[PDB]
Amino acid sequence: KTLVVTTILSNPYCMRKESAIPLSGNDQFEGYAVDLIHEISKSLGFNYKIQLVPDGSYGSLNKLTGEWNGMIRELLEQRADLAIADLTITFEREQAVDFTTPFMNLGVSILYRKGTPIESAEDLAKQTRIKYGALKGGSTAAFFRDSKISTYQRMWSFMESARPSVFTASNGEGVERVAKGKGSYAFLMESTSIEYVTERNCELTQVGGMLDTKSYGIATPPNSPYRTAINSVILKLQEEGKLHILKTKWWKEKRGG
Amino acid sequence: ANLKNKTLVVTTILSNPYCMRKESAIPLSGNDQFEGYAVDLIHEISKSLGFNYKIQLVPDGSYGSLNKLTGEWNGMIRELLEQRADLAIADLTITFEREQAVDFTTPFMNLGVSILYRKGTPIESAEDLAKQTRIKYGALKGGSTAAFFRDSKISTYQRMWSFMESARPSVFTASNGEGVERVAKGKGSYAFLMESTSIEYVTERNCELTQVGGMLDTKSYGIATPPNSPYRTAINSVILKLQEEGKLHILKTKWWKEKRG
Numbered sequence A: 001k002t003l004v005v006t007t008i009l010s011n012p013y014c015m016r017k018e019s020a021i022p023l024s025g026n027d028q029f030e031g032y033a034v035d036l037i038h039e040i041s042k043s044l045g046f047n048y049k050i051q052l053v054p055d056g057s058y059g060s061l062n063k064l065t066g067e068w069n070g071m072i073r074e075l076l077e078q079r080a081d082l083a084i085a086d087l088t089i090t091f092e093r094e095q096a097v098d099f100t101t102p103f104m105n106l107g108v109s110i111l112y113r114k115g116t117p118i119e120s121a122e123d124l125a126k127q128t129r130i131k132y133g134a135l136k137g138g139s140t141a142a143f144f145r146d147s148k149i150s151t152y153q154r155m156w157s158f159m160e161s162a163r164p165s166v167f168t169a170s171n172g173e174g175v176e177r178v179a180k181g182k183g184s185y186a187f188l189m190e191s192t193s194i195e196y197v198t199e200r201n202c203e204l205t206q207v208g209g210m211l212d213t214k215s216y217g218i219a220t221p222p223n224s225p226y227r228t229a230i231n232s233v234i235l236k237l238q239e240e241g242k243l244h245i246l247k248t249k250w251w252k253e254k255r256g257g
Numbered sequence B: 001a002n003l004k005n006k007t008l009v010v011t012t013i014l015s016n017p018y019c020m021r022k023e024s025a026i027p028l029s030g031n032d033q034f035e036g037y038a039v040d041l042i043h044e045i046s047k048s049l050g051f052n053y054k055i056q057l058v059p060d061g062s063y064g065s066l067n068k069l070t071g072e073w074n075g076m077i078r079e080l081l082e083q084r085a086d087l088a089i090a091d092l093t094i095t096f097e098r099e100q101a102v103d104f105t106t107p108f109m110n111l112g113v114s115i116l117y118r119k120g121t122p123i124e125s126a127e128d129l130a131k132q133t134r135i136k137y138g139a140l141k142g143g144s145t146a147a148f149f150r151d152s153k154i155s156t157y158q159r160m161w162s163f164m165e166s167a168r169p170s171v172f173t174a175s176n177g178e179g180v181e182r183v184a185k186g187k188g189s190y191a192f193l194m195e196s197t198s199i200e201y202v203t204e205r206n207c208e209l210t211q212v213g214g215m216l217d218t219k220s221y222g223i224a225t226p227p228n229s230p231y232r233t234a235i236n237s238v239i240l241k242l243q244e245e246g247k248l249h250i251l252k253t254k255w256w257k258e259k260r261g
């Protein structure tokens, strides 16, 4: 059979491949997610077409309209069979689509300069000289805004009250603000992104662990007949080392893409 | 389906710091005799969903392995299949093999194999170990780490597996604690491959040991249920909410860094 796969550009999950000759179809794209679906399709014997989500969104719920956008909407409107991207499995998305077994685990962590005694979020919340922020309007900021845990409330109050603003318009802007800050600024974001950055900037490091836990998985329309088949392939690819090879390839070897 | 006012049997196994006997001047009874990460976790889940439960240690002291000759399971896996427990909460690895017999919830913890070694050597990775022969390296006999090496098709790990199987005297151990001691007393002559979470627990408590490199694979612990259990999806939602709020990370910090037994 032939499936439509929706995805979104995000380094190094799905990137446009550089080429002197113009590329078409699936060859336009490369990255971890591109390789992952290639391997899944080999096991299960389907063909597929990768299509970027036309609206450029992951999928959020309009809470007063009930409508989804992004890759989620493509699934629910029968324009994609699978969504394969750095798409976070959340209780909310699980109420509208199904998710496979995760292919990657991650969590909020801290990007900072190497070689200081700052070892944890707790070390940042106990001090006031170092400023710290996050992407404006993103899920990292929401983790802090929404928390009822005293530690993270104190941090959110500090972040919201800092001037100039500690929130950035992009993750890259936060990375650069750390890199040029001489320790005056730390940036909270996904641990997988931090690893991507620290593989490419020897002066930076992750600080502490993962303050939350979450995963990326493939999304399907509810009751898709392909979900359990993909779950088994994902576990098999994992247990033989194929996903480990793909992670190293894209985070450590392809210094870009 | 509904869990309010129900009483569940929960099987577990002693394993630090998931489930440990609590110290007390007076003997403790029932659930109060145990403490640890898994004990706190099931308490939280029970409060959210409104059920009661009794913790019972698995009688045969085993996690659950499949005898391929006979088809028989043992351990906590068997207790679920024989309907003598409703849930198994422990450091029980979600594997494809176990998934063909029982169900698992959403994972509560993610981990992977890594290296326990002495602090401050030139060894930086598994690749460094694999390309040399002077430093010996091993794992727990018959466990998930050994199965990972046995099942890897990656050249590095397949090479390591061949080396470990060939080494005389045996590099395998009967417990993780024996492996830890072999690293400590080995002064660099021995490295031990085991779960990253166990390496973290050890290195928090022995300052001369360290983790070398990252994870060589990925695997998770989840709550196991009888197949087709009507409670799995309700528990999944509770776990996802604890994960998204950071409460499992806080629980891990408590049992790994704050408490000592």
Ligand SMILES: CN[C@H](CC(=O)O)C(=O)O
Pocket: A058, A059, A086, A087, A088, A138, A139, A140
């Ligand atoms: C890279 N993941 C995006 C952004 C986020 O979760 O904050 C998403 O799944 O919506």
Ligand SMILES: CN[C@H](CC(=O)O)C(=O)O
Pocket: B063, B064, B091, B092, B093, B140, B142, B143, B144, B145
């Ligand atoms: C602590 N996990 C046990 C033992 C092992 O993985 O070797 C298991 O899942 O069987």
